Design a protein around this ligand. Structure first.
Ligand SMILES: N[C@H](C(=O)O)c1ccc(C(=O)O)c(C(=O)O)c1
Lengths: 83, 50, 308
């Protein structure tokens, strides 16, 4: 229920994979899947691309918003759990 | 461990605090906040006012 | 993406270019619609020359009979034929179908925001009631590399995506009738790349350069993560984020101003119905309106409060 890719510098993402329900509802094929796949593609390009962030790996921490404010607040909390 | 909060005064402050107290399930009672949008049980469920 | 103040300014410019001065607004509950309509009202008053008849608000939870009531209040002023909308797709579709039920075809002249855009769903099976609508969208282009990447994905190779199984189940209408899982995307099912994909990739690259430049300054000649760059300070990284300049995936430049905003650049579409139906580009906005009137096709109608 959360996408991990490890790396030296870690970025976070928030995308509406599911619709607003029940907290969550139906899958969004276009607004949710295409966009997170695009972020993963961009990360892969940067990592494979030389002379841009050379010898430094980018990872990802991708979460779901479910098109709601409170759910995104909880996911932001898991972003900031380190402090 | 906090079991209940005597709320804030301004409505905006109460809204901001309630968004988190909802997540951690802590009752809130306010003494001065009168915004009509705090009567919605779906979004502000642990909020009460005197 | 640019803020909605520029979109409101473009809408005012379109209205004043079309010779209209009597309009009614329509907004959905929330930050987006209300803020957009408020910006439109403030700009239109300050400039002058455009008068607003009514302002209506669509509730978040629509009670029965809401859309008919909204249409009937709009018809209380019959010289206000232009409606400026900041509304979601479902609200737009329901408003259009309520207009069709009350038989008001041709009365209203729609001007919608990026929530309308180029979407088939609001106008599907309701072409006549939504013919001639003018919409706005930030400029964008399709990316071929992402298309190759998405068409090459399978269940075996794409395992880092936790939700990919559900997408596979829904896309092909199968259960993992049953399916063997050997289906290929864009061959056995319809496919078209989403609109904001570019804006996602650009965003990622905005980090990628902003970090990189930092490592070129705070880490002179040291390869890899630095002892001082281990603690990446957010406040310092903000300046590097806001002072970037590079070419994006489409090839257009990417810049931020002092407030972290992209410059306003828009395309204008009109829904036209010929003997197929499409959204046709009729102009653009790059801090000054560039609109073609020779290529506009309505069922031009005027929205004026009284004739001279
Ligand atoms: N009910 C309103 C509100 O909802 O904000 C309110 C709340 C608190 C105060 C206060 O600080 O004493 C006041 C006031 O200025 O008298 C007004």
């Amino acid at each position: 229920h959360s996408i991990r890719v490890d790396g030296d510098i870690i970025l976070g993402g928030l995308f509406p994979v599911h619709a607003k329900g029940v907290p969550c509802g139906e899958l969004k094929k276009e607004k949710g899947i295409h966009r997170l796949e695009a972020m993963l593609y961009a990360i892969d390009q940067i990592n494979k691309d030389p002379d841009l962030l050379s010898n430094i790996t980018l990872g990802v921490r991708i979460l779901d918003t479910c098109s709601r404010d409170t759910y995104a607040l909880e996911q932001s909390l898991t972003f900031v759990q380190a402090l | 461990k906090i079991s209940g909060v005597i709320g804030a005064a301004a409505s905006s402050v109460s809204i901001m605090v309630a968004n988190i107290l909802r997540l951690f399930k802590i009752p809130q009672i306010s003494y001065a906040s009168t915004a009509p949008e705090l009567s919605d049980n779906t979004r502000y469920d642990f909020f009460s006012r005197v | 993406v640019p803020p909605d103040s520029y979109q409101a300014q473009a809408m005012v410019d379109i209205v004043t270019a079309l010779g209209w001065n009597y309009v009614s607004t329509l907004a959905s509950e929330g930050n987006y619609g209300e803020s957009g309509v408020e910006a439109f009202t403030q700009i239109s008053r300050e400039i002058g020359g455009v008068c607003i008849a009514q302002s209506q608000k669509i509730p978040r939870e629509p009670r029965p009979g809401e859309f008919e009531k909204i249409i009937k209040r709009l018809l209380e002023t019959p010289n206000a034929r232009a409606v400026i909308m900041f509304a979601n797709e479902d609200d737009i579709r329901r408003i259009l179908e309520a207009a069709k039920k009350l038989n008001q075809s041709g009365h209203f002249l729609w001007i919608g925001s990026d929530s309308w855009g180029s979407k088939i769903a609001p106008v599907y099976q309701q072409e006549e009631i939504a013919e001639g609508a003018v919409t706005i969208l930030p400029k964008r282009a399709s990316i071929d590399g992402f298309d190759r990447y998405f068409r090459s994905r399978t269940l075996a190779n794409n395992r880092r995506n936790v939700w990919f199984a559900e997408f596979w189940e829904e896309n092909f209408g199968c259960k993992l009738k049953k399916c063997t899982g050997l289906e290929r995307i864009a061959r056995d099912s319809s496919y078209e790349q989403e609109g904001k994909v570019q804006f996602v990739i650009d965003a990622v690259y905005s980090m990628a350069y902003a970090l990189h430049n930092m490592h070129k300054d705070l880490c002179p000649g040291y390869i890899g993560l630095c002892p001082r760059m281990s603690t990446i300070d957010g406040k310092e990284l903000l300046g590097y984020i806001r002072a970037v300049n590079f070419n994006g995936s489409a090839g257009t430049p990417v810049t931020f101003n002092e407030n972290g905003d992209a410059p306003g650049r828009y395309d204008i579409f009109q829904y036209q119905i010929t003997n197929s139906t499409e959204y046709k580009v009729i102009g653009h906005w790059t801090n000054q309106l560039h609109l073609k009137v020779e290529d506009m096709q309505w069922a031009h109608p005027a929205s004026v409060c009284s004739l001279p």
